[PDB]
Each structure stands twice: as structure tokens, then as C-alpha cells.
Design a protein around this ligand. Structure first.
Ligand SMILES: Cn1ccc2ccc(C(=O)O)cc21
Length: 209
């Protein structure tokens, strides 16, 4: 049972800008997703301070980076607070309408796309390198869901009956054919070292057979 939704016009416009603007510094997508994971982990850690049972769905707070060259996917997994179905539908838990407004004003004033996270809409930088993004998520207060979009103005949401996640979010980047450098160990290590040095959770880069 798959529900298809239209993005809000402003978010479709954000996505089209990210996909169509010439802009070479695409590697910042990984910084932005890791920052989103860190923010999600901070949230479940805060809730656990007064309610330890919030970690019954998983005590370890971490981020895994999983490249798969056969599937052409880079997966960012975190064990943070996760998203409810409403969060997914409401722009993956962001205030993306007002964030997009500010971001586009900043761009016209001289900012560049690398500054997207300052506007709270860093998730959509995934579309710098991905033709399709799939988000699997599980919040303590809801079932497990899959969100997906190849842009083009719509996204889908379904209940996910696949591999159970415990708690947190998994962003599966189906990379564009010319962006496979982001599956290479040395390239991922370089970007994490450059941009994510002060993320306060373990970031494990999986290796491939
Ligand atoms: C890939 N994978 C790992 C654990 C697991 C459990 C269920 C399913 C499924 O498709 O139901 C897939 C799974």
C-alpha cells in the first residue's frame, strides 16, 4: 500500500535548483547527512536522560556509512530518534518551506549551495549526487516506514515490512552514474575527515568484498 504525495511547491523548487544548478562542490551532501544524523542522535540521547527506556530499541548511538558498488548505493544509517509517518510527510521533520525561502534569498545575495545546512534543509543536498533517495525510518512512537523520491515533484510513503531497524534512520542514496566516486573508501574517508571532524558519535565506514 503505497501513498504518493506532491511536494510543496517551494520544496519541489528547492529540489529542482539542487539538481539543475551547475555546482561542482557536491561532496558536501555527506557532511549534511551526517549532521542530520548527529542531530537525530542528540534528540534520542536527550530524551534518554530522563527516560532510560527510550533506549530499549537500541542503546548504541552511532552512524554507519555503507557503500555498495553492485547496487550503486551509499547508505547513511544512524540510531537516532527516527521519524514518525507525519514527520516524513512534513518534509522529513524540517521546516523546509521557510528554510527554502531563506536559502534561496541567500543564494541570490551571493551564498552558495554548500551553505544549505544553515537553512535547515541539508537533507535535500542528497540530490546533488543521487537520482533516487530512499529513507527508512523507525521512531519509538510509530511503525517502520519507507519514504522515497526521484524528485519530479512527488514522493511516496509506505509501511516497511523489510529488515527491522530497531530505531533510527537509514538514507539510501541511489547514486547518479557519474557520482560513483562516493562509493570509494579513500574518497569517503577524505570527506568525513574534512567536514565531520567534530561529530560526537562513532562513524564507521564499512568496507566491501
Ligand atoms: C535484508 N534483511 C535483513 C533482515 C531482514 C528481515 C526481514 C526482511 C524482509 O524482507 O522481510 C529482510 C531482511
Amino acid at each position: 500500500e503505497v501513498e504518493t504525495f506532491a511536494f510543496q511547491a517551494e520544496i519541489a523548487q528547492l529540489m529542482s535548483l539542487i539538481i539543475n544548478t551547475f555546482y561542482s562542490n557536491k561532496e558536501i551532501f555527506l557532511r549534511e547527512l551526517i549532521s542530520n544524523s548527529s542531530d537525530a542522535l542528540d534528540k534520542i540521547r536527550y530524551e534518554s536522560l530522563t527516560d532510560p527506556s527510550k533506549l530499549d530499541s537500541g542503546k548504541e548511538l552511532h552512524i554507519n556509512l555503507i557503500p555498495n558498488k553492485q547496487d550503486r548505493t551509499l547508505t547513511i544509517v544512524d540510531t537516532g530518534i527516527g521519524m514518525t509517518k507525519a514527520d516524513l510527510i512534513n518534509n522529513l521533520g524540517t521546516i523546509a518551506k521557510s528554510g527554502t525561502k531563506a536559502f534561496m534569498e541567500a543564494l541570490q545575495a551571493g551564498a552558495d549551495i554548500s551553505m544549505i545546512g544553515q537553512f535547515g534543509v541539508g537533507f535535500y543536498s542528497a540530490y546533488l549526487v543521487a537520482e533516487k533517495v530512499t529513507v527508512i525510518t523507525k521512531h519509538n512512537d510509530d511503525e517502520q516506514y519507507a519514504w522515497e523520491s526521484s524528485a519530479g515533484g512527488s514522493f511516496t510513503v509506505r509501511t516497511d515490512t523489510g529488515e527491522p531497524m530497531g530505531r533510527g534512520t537509514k538514507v539510501i542514496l541511489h547514486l547518479k552514474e557519474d557520482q560513483t566516486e562516493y562509493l570509494e573508501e579513500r574518497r569517503i574517508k577524505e570527506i568525513v575527515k574534512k567536514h565531520s571532524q567534530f561529530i560526537g558519535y562513532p562513524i564507521t565506514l564499512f568496507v566491501e568484498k
